[PDB]
Design an enzyme around this catalytic site. Sequence first.
Site, PDB file in Angstrom:
ATOM      1  N   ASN A 147      49.197  65.233 -21.667  1.00 28.21           N
ATOM      2  CA  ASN A 147      48.920  65.208 -22.964  1.00 28.21           C
ATOM      3  C   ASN A 147      50.979  65.356 -23.253  1.00 28.21           C
ATOM      4  OD1 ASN A 147      50.413  69.079 -22.975  1.00 28.21           O
ATOM      5  ND2 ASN A 147      49.797  68.470 -20.904  1.00 28.21           N
ATOM      6  N   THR A 187      40.847  34.419  -5.496  1.00 32.06           N
ATOM      7  CA  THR A 187      38.671  34.448  -6.877  1.00 32.06           C
ATOM      8  C   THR A 187      38.513  33.073  -6.944  1.00 32.06           C
ATOM      9  OG1 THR A 187      40.720  36.457  -7.484  1.00 32.06           O
ATOM     10  CG2 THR A 187      38.768  36.557  -8.693  1.00 32.06           C
ATOM     11  N   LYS A 214      36.333  31.543  -9.680  1.00 30.93           N
ATOM     12  CA  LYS A 214      36.034  30.822 -11.159  1.00 30.93           C
ATOM     13  C   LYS A 214      34.879  30.700 -11.212  1.00 30.93           C
ATOM     14  CE  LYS A 214      40.348  33.538 -11.757  1.00 30.93           C
ATOM     15  NZ  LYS A 214      40.147  34.897 -12.305  1.00 30.93           N
ATOM     16  N   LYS A 271      35.273  33.050 -14.119  1.00 27.92           N
ATOM     17  CA  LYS A 271      35.343  34.917 -14.271  1.00 27.92           C
ATOM     18  C   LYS A 271      33.795  35.475 -13.764  1.00 27.92           C
ATOM     19  CE  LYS A 271      38.024  36.752 -15.912  1.00 27.92           C
ATOM     20  NZ  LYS A 271      39.348  38.134 -15.485  1.00 27.92           N
ATOM     21  N   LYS A 289      36.549  36.364  -3.124  1.00 29.29           N
ATOM     22  CA  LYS A 289      37.346  37.504  -4.195  1.00 29.29           C
ATOM     23  C   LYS A 289      36.162  37.487  -5.061  1.00 29.29           C
ATOM     24  CE  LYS A 289      39.745  40.185  -7.529  1.00 29.29           C
ATOM     25  NZ  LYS A 289      40.210  39.513  -8.575  1.00 29.29           N
ATOM     26  N   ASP A 342      35.804  38.119  -9.038  1.00 30.74           N
ATOM     27  CA  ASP A 342      36.384  38.435 -10.297  1.00 30.74           C
ATOM     28  C   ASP A 342      36.635  40.289 -10.953  1.00 30.74           C
ATOM     29  OD1 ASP A 342      38.187  37.388 -12.048  1.00 30.74           O
ATOM     30  OD2 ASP A 342      37.321  38.612 -13.281  1.00 30.74           O
ATOM     31  N   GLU A 343      37.530  41.175 -11.220  1.00 34.76           N
ATOM     32  CA  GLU A 343      37.344  42.251 -11.525  1.00 34.76           C
ATOM     33  C   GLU A 343      36.053  42.776 -12.201  1.00 34.76           C
ATOM     34  OE1 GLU A 343      39.575  40.277 -12.251  1.00 34.76           O
ATOM     35  OE2 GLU A 343      40.717  40.138 -14.243  1.00 34.76           O
ATOM     36  N   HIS A 373      41.721  46.100  -7.094  1.00 33.85           N
ATOM     37  CA  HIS A 373      41.943  45.879  -8.427  1.00 33.85           C
ATOM     38  C   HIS A 373      42.273  46.466  -9.713  1.00 33.85           C
ATOM     39  CE1 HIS A 373      42.133  42.781 -11.605  1.00 33.85           C
ATOM     40  NE2 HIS A 373      42.511  42.039 -10.868  1.00 33.85           N
ATOM     41  N   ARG A 374      43.772  46.061  -9.916  1.00 39.07           N
ATOM     42  CA  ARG A 374      44.811  47.204 -10.765  1.00 39.07           C
ATOM     43  C   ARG A 374      44.452  46.781 -12.303  1.00 39.07           C
ATOM     44  NH1 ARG A 374      51.033  44.991 -10.923  1.00 39.07           N
ATOM     45  NH2 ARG A 374      50.477  42.836 -11.401  1.00 39.07           N
ATOM     46  N   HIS A 389      46.530  45.263  -5.640  1.00 38.87           N
ATOM     47  CA  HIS A 389      47.363  43.774  -6.572  1.00 38.87           C
ATOM     48  C   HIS A 389      49.206  44.649  -6.841  1.00 38.87           C
ATOM     49  CE1 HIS A 389      45.037  40.673  -7.593  1.00 38.87           C
ATOM     50  NE2 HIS A 389      44.103  41.339  -6.314  1.00 38.87           N
ATOM     51  N   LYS A 443      59.772  36.491 -12.789  1.00 38.36           N
ATOM     52  CA  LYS A 443      60.188  38.009 -13.798  1.00 38.36           C
ATOM     53  C   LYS A 443      61.879  38.025 -13.306  1.00 38.36           C
ATOM     54  CE  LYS A 443      56.759  40.776 -12.381  1.00 38.36           C
ATOM     55  NZ  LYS A 443      56.433  42.420 -11.236  1.00 38.36           N
ATOM     56  N   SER A 454      48.807  37.033  -6.791  1.00 35.89           N
ATOM     57  CA  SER A 454      47.894  36.652  -7.820  1.00 35.89           C
ATOM     58  C   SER A 454      48.242  36.471  -8.807  1.00 35.89           C
ATOM     59  CB  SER A 454      46.988  37.249  -7.625  1.00 35.89           C
ATOM     60  OG  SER A 454      47.119  38.594  -8.091  1.00 35.89           O
TER      61      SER A 454
END
Lengths: 113, 113, 456, 456, 456, 228
Positions: free
Chosen positions: D113, D163, D165, D167, D191, D193-194, D284-285, D317, D324, D369
């Site tokens: 909160n 992954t 594809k 997806k 993998k 996909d999420e 997976h995030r 992940h 970056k 990834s």
Amino acid sequence: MQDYNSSLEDVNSRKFGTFSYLPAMDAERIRKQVEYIVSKGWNPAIEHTEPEHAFDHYWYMWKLPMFGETNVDAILKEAEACHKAHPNNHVRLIGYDNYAQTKGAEMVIYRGK
Amino acid sequence: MQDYNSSLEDVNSRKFGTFSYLPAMDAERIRKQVEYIVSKGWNPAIEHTEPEHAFDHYWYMWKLPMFGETNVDAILKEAEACHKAHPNNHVRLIGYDNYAQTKGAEMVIYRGK
Amino acid sequence: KTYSAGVKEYRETYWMPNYTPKDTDILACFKITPQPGVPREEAAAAVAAESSTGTWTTVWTDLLTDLDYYKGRAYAIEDVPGDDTCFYAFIAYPIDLFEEGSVVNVFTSLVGNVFGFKAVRALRLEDVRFPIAYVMTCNGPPHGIQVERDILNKYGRPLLGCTIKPKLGLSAKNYGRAVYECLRGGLDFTKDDENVNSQPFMRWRQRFDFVMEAIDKAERETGERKGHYLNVTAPTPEEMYKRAEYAKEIGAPIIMHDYITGGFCANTGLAQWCRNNGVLLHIHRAMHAVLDRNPHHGIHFRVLTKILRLSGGDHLHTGTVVGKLEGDRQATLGWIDLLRESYVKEDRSRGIFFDQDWGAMPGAFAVASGGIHVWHMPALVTIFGDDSVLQFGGGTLGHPWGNAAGACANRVALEACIEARNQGIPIEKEGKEVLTKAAAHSPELKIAMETWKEIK
Amino acid sequence: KTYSAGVKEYRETYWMPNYTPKDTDILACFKITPQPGVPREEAAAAVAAESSTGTWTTVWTDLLTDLDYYKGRAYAIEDVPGDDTCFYAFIAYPIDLFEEGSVVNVFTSLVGNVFGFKAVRALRLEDVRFPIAYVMTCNGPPHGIQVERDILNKYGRPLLGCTIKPKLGLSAKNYGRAVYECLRGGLDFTKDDENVNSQPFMRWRQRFDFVMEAIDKAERETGERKGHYLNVTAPTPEEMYKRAEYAKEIGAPIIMHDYITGGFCANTGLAQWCRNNGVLLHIHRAMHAVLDRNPHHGIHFRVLTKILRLSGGDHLHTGTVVGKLEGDRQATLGWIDLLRESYVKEDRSRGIFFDQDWGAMPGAFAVASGGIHVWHMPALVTIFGDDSVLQFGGGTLGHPWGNAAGACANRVALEACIEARNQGIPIEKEGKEVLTKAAAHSPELKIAMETWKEIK
Amino acid sequence: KTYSAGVKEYRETYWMPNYTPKDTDILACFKITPQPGVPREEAAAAVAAESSTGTWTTVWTDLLTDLDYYKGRAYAIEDVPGDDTCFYAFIAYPIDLFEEGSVVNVFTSLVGNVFGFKAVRALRLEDVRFPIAYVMTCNGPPHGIQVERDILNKYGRPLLGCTIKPKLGLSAKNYGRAVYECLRGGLDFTKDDENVNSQPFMRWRQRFDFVMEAIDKAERETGERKGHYLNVTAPTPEEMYKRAEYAKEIGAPIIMHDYITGGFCANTGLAQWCRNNGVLLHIHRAMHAVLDRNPHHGIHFRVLTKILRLSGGDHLHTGTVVGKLEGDRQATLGWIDLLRESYVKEDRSRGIFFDQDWGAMPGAFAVASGGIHVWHMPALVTIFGDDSVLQFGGGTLGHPWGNAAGACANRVALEACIEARNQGIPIEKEGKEVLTKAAAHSPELKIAMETWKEIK
Amino acid sequence: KTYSAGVKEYRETYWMPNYTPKDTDILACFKITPQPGVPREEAAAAVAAESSTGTWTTVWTDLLTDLDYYKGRAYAIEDVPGDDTCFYAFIAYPIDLFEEGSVVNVFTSLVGNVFGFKAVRALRLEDVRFPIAYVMTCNGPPHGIQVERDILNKYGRPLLGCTIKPKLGLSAKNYGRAVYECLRGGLDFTKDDENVNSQPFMRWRQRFDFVMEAIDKAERETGERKGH
């Protein structure tokens, strides 16, 4: 349009099976029911119970069922005797159908409470 | 700083839903609640029960809900008739919301016991 | 179509301005703050592609299936009224993309990875249109407003609750004593704090036992049905179900779950369990502000409201309007409607970008809480209406005479406001006089009004 | 000591600048952007109070317990380097406040909160110190890096994944064909996909069956152990456990879960299930960017990394560093260390505000990834090291010669980079020449290098 | 014999006019409207062959077994009295052809494919003789008439029931209120409508709960045992058993199933469950008119009556005799006898083509329902006798004074008719005077008699 | 809106010729052969009433709910091409009337009692429109055509089957021998007859065992997937 007038606190709201929604049976109506039981070949019997225990499956048997009894007056005097011995109890008249092994008839002929 | 004054033995501790924490409704407050029920388009109804059975989901219906009734005086007279017929019972005024299939309003307008 | 390896733009495939959404499509509105130099259509198409079937480089497996059907597509771009750094993108997804009856799947698809896409500076999911065909695959609230009112036998007013405070530190018996005092004072509900699960100072079984003791005593004393949201939020689903089963075993009418921190999977399972076991489900929205506070990044709370209604909950914390701006007030009214109504029409002033049909799926109680007290009673009653739960944690336990007096003060204030509203009084305009007239007959309410200052 | 009703400031009770954190305290660092006019100490104390035991008005029940012990307290305030609108507040919470072995409880308490509190404009949870005493109550990764390498019989290199594809949209048999081609090409893993859970075009049982067929064929063909992260993310915990049980039944070595969208409760339950059933758990995030992208509001991904390690996962992940900023590079290295190391020292340059002791709790594989291909192989190998999984979804299926050739190209690039690194070559400085020398013997790698542009 | 491939006529093998049916044979009577040009014996033999062991062309596997024994055979042809386009064919099937205790199997064998055979224009299964040897393999009614009367403690009169109306649209609490009013008025039973299973406006668990609340209140108020047929008809057997188990858990004495639309498999399973759990089973015959209405095509309701008695049911809807033809009157009396009696003799006037021995298998209550009211009480009592349930849905809810008054009116009418019958009055001849004398003491009955028109 | 006891006609409430069906409505087409003297609209409205919420006499509990919403309504009548003794009635039912994912409920509601109603001589349910919203609540085929072809690895042709004959009378081993010969010859499937469940001459467990023995031998012999 009127209210039905039945409640948990009103003791007159309690019912006791067949013919309890009709006016209380008089001597003439009881005799006709006894005659009906005899005409079917059913075995008359008398049970009674305290009104608070009227919901129970088993009432008190008044002596034994009058097996093979066809005298209407004898049946009526047995019911009256049970009523005198237990004036505060509901008294039930029963016709046992031994072939179906059921009660062909069951009705309170003397209301207690 | 005072004690709350509620207890299991004190019968005045019992509450009966909406508006039971307010002073007992007088005639004008009851009329205003009836007017609110009518203005919502809800169907007025009267129920009642013995105070010991006030916790039950089902109270006794007083006749039928006054479906489509918009006359406030008629609703008030029906509530008064229920109160007179059962002076010891709690009398509840209800607005049935048939579209939501809920009670839009419910309040004890006559306190028993 | 042939296979040509390499990177291609998302705009030519995933941007279809002439697409007409189907009645079964899931529609999403994204407020996009794009990276400088990226055109609006490219950003919208990138969001659509990354959220449905897209990939950063062409893959041959695409040609094994019908991408023209399965893909999500951006079909409209609008300007955000006011702010010009962002724009609204409307994206349609065929219903086939999602597992039926899985808010987990729809949520993962919509918000799984597009929020970190480099083509956008910021991204906010504003609204999602769940087609009625998808809505009917979800369990929804275990009971809903009307069934809950029938179960609790409470009509014609908002319900009253109170979170037990301090949030942590009380033993089970002291906790139950506080619960008993609140409930006997006149509250319908008490509530475990969101972080009360099973602590060394109060293990959950002890809390459940003493709460039920308190509930029984209060119900016998007042003659009104009482409840306490027993928090079953747990480390594992097995533990959550164990706590729910024990709550059912001891006769608890209602339990509570933190559906965001506990998670949508556990929450949906618990909602189905509650339907199967006849237990009301109060949903706490802990962590919502991490998602919904930032106006340019995250997920708007109206989306979370729709998700919760589909996942299942009989109550949902919707926040208090008091002290909010007009836009925030309108948005709150909109998501309250989304929580409770059968059909919610598009209303841009409320941020409702899509008509939302709920069919026969029942609504949930809207829960108001947070720093509210008796002086807020008028506004709350005006804002939330009858189908709400008003929770006074501090407003009840912070009463100078204790929990029972504070509960009585809150109950008297609520009933006075409700009666005045039924009589036609404008309650929010003149709440002070309604409360004062009520306090003339309620010393608890009078001293409560003295304890906390008027809000205006 | 005595009860005095009314509202009081949080600063006098919840701000303790002289408090020395105990070795068992949970410590939190909050970057606070306070509301104008609110002093820093008041904001920090408000965060501490609302996150631990505070309430907006004084309640008498506080005096039934030892508030001086149970409360969370702000004990330090620092300036944020650069930005002056925000400040770091350090808050200590006694370990007694939390249910043991419950990341759900700790998370709910910390972020439940306070992020919506009016006293702060914005709030970001930067770091949390989990004391070793609390760490040992959590299950942690079901297997961890070393156990996983022993199970898979793979050493001395990062693992390679992909992954599948698109997806969504592939039938189960076509999906399995793609999996088989990837695995036979040289990848260790494929993998889901999420958002692949169980769709009308590919129901989960069919996908599991054909994936296992593909895995068996590829393992027989190559003689190397293969896996495919079967996604068990499901609407309900019962469905999740059913899918996990079926994966175990058909011999799947590894499953996958979306721990944020599925939720921490389901994830912790699944991690314990994986430990009990000997199945590797890939995490997976999805939705992480909703929480962690905004630098002023939300939860930093290093906190989510710690939470995942405690909740349980064999892979996590962690994002790709390529593209970056320098601060983002350092933060990524820091949370990779938090994911994998036994002890992580405080390092302000990495945003690590606390020493984090993991004791004997094993680390998890760091998963890279997202838009990566062969040209990224050097940097990845330099950044992540051996204990990582490098996932090339598009980089494998987007190969002009299909999945097997793309997998072979990725495997050759990885092995060339690893051999060159073992030989002492500076791989990130001269990655082009290492890759070119490798491509001299691998046509698949050569055409892969031609397919995607060089990356600096 | 030898194997000779090719098509041969059915008459030479499957028509045996000299065959004497065995005591263990299943006998079937088919009213056949044959295709023009097809002789009667050929049509009968075709029906026998296609229903038992026949095939359109000779198969060699026939000679691996003794089809002189296993085949069904037509052994008699009779003229249909009146109509000359059709004829009665009597076919005998050895008991070995059928799975023991499987009305599903016998039904599938008899009616599975012969009704679509090209050799007949129309086909009606008129009657089936179940040998006592097969009857004893079936569970039959879970309790039967006598056991049910003992359980309910009700003797010497038909039972009174009432379907709650409207069929759909009531909430669970309003539904329970209607149930309570009906039961407190004097009815023995209330009833879910056949299509009340679990609707969005009234989920089944809520309906069960509020029905049980109503039953308890009415039983306490009247001192007579009450029941409500809770409909457990469900999408799946698991759901049906779940609803039955919950009904048992809350103490429901009786449940209800639609045995044709739910299916014979589910119904037989439910009947066995009811025997195992001591719950009475009321059987609704929804869809019966699809099968039994057409006099030239379909399955006569006496066959469905026998099937239901074997499959299991304590009550069975047998229809109302009022408004039926003289042949229809007799057919109704015949199938009532088939439902209730231990032995039913052949009676062509009633359409009973075979003696049906039930042995010790108990009979089921015959249920009369559909547009009946107080004026029908005499006829009903005369037609059905004591071992029946008379259901007044509209006749109770449609009373001008509500459910309690309508229930009281129906109860008074029934008891007056029963008392007059016991006294020897001809009830069907003078029902008006009996009802009028009763109404002299019952205002509810008087206004009920005024509400609906006299029937003669 | 007010309670008036007594019998009323179905036409005034359950016949709505101006009703436009909603996208979530279940629609039914009934071919009605009406009883002589009964007007078409009364027959159509009677079918609509008895199948959804109607009752033969007015009941006060109707006013506790929103009958205007929940009722089924006849919204169109058409002539049957050719035959004039019957007509087509189109009736719309709100989706709320039915349990989700329950063909049992929808089927019971539509055909439960209207086929025996006195107002019609004969009645045929011709077609039912299941809205996509209701379709998605039903499980549907466990696998469907494409999944089955993938499971069986059979493409580009119809599948071939054969019911084992005689329908009854074969022992389990003889039954399995017949199954094996069919499957080894090139059929994809063999089939139990509809009345083959578990008979004294062939108990089901024995039939299951010898069928699987037959399937395995045929699959090894032909190299093609087989079933029974």
